C-alpha cells in the first residue's frame, strides 16, 4: 500500500498472507471467507508470462497476522492447502479478466480475536454500495513505493466512474472489474502495489453494519500514479462461480 497507515490491531481479521516455503517470501494477500476457504487473485498463482505457476505444495497460508515478517507466536495460524481452484475463464493473456481463485485449507481454522471471515456480497448489497464516490478499504503488506512495512497497511479509496476508469488506460476493461482511487485534482492519494494482489477491497454495510468483500486487488500501471487508478475483480459478478466450487467441493 502507498499512502496508507498502520492497521489497528484486529482490524482485518480476514486478511491472509500467501507465503511460499522456498524461498520464504510473501506471494500475495488473500481473504478468509469461511473456516476452510480463502479467496485470492488467480494471477497470484498463475501467470505464465512471468512463468508464475504455484501448486498447493508450494504454499502456506498465514492467518491472523499483523507483523509482516515475524512469526506471531500464539496469534497466527499457518495453513496448508488441499486444493486450488482458478476460474476456468481467467484471461491472463489479455487483461486479467476474472482474476479470482479459491483455496481449500487442509483443516478449517478456529476463529479468534484476530481471525474472522468476511462476508460475500449479495445483489441488494452490491447494488447499494458499488457506487462512484463510495469508499472502500484495501489492506496489505505490499510495497510502500512504486520499502516494505513492518506492519499491515490500510487505505480507503473511492469507487471511480466506469468511463474515467476506461479513459485511464489502453487496457480493455470489462464488467468483471471496477477501478478505485483518487482523481488527480482531489488532494488525497493512495493505492495498492506489488505484494497487495489477492487482498480484499471491503465496504461496511450501512444497513446491517457488516463488512463485505466487494473486490480483489488485481492490477494497475504503477502505484499511486496521477491520472491512474487501481483495478479490482468484481466479486459479486463472479459469485455464482464461487458458490459452485463451494457446492461441488
Amino acid at each position: 500500500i502507498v499512502e496508507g497507515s498502520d492497521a489497528e490491531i484486529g482490524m482485518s481479521p480476514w486478511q491472509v498472507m500467501l507465503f511460499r516455503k522456498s524461498p520464504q517470501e510473501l506471494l500475495c494477500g488473500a481473504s478468509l471467507i469461511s473456516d476452510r476457504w480463502v479467496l485470492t487473485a488467480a494471477h497470484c498463482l498463475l501467470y505464465p508470462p512471468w512463468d508464475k505457476n504455484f501448486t498447493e505444495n508450494d504454499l502456506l497460508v498465514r492467518i491472523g497476522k499483523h507483523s509482516r515478517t515475524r512469526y506471531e507466536r500464539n496469534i497466527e495460524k499457518i495453513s496448508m492447502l488441499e486444493k486450488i481452484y482458478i476460474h476456468p475463464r481467467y484471461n491472463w493473456r489479455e487483461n486479467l479478466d476474472r482474476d479470482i481463485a479459491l483455496m481449500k485449507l487442509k483443516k478449517p481454522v478456529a476463529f479468534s480475536d484476530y481471525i474472522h471471515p468476511v462476508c460475500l456480497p449479495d445483489r441488494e448489497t452490491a447494488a447499494s454500495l458499488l457506487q462512484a464516490g463510495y469508499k472502500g478499504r484495501v489492506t496489505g503488506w505490499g510495497n510502500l513505493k512504486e520499502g516494505q512495512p513492518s506492519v499491515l497497511q490500510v487505505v480507503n479509496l473511492p469507487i471511480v466512474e466506469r468511463p474515467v476508469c476506461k479513459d485511464s488506460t489502453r487496457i480493455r476493461i470489462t464488467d468483471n472489474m471496477f477501478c478505485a482511487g483518487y482523481k488527480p485534482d482531489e488532494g488525497k492519494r493512495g493505492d495498492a502495489c506489488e505484494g497487495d494482489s489477492g487482498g480484499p477491497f471491503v465496504m461496511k454495510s450501512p444497513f446491517n453494519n457488516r463488512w463485505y468483500q466487494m473486490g480483489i486487488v488485481s492490477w494497475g500501471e504503477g502505484c499511486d500514479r496521477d491520472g491512474k487508478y487501481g483495478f479490482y475483480t468484481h466479486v459479486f459478478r463472479l459469485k455464482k462461480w464461487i458458490q459452485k466450487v463451494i457446492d461441488q467441493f
Binding site: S5, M11, P13, G133, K135, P206, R210
Partner: peptide, 26 residues
C-alpha cells in the same frame, strides 16, 4: 453467519480510527 463482524470492534461496539470516512461517503 457471524461474518464481517470483527471480534475486536463490532462485537464490542468499538469503532476503528477511519471507518467513519467510509460511512460518510455512503
Amino acid at each position: 453467519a457471524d461474518c464481517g463482524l470483527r471480534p475486536l470492534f463490532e462485537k464490542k461496539s468499538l469503532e476503528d480510527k477511519t471507518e467513519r470516512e467510509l460511512l460518510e461517503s455512503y
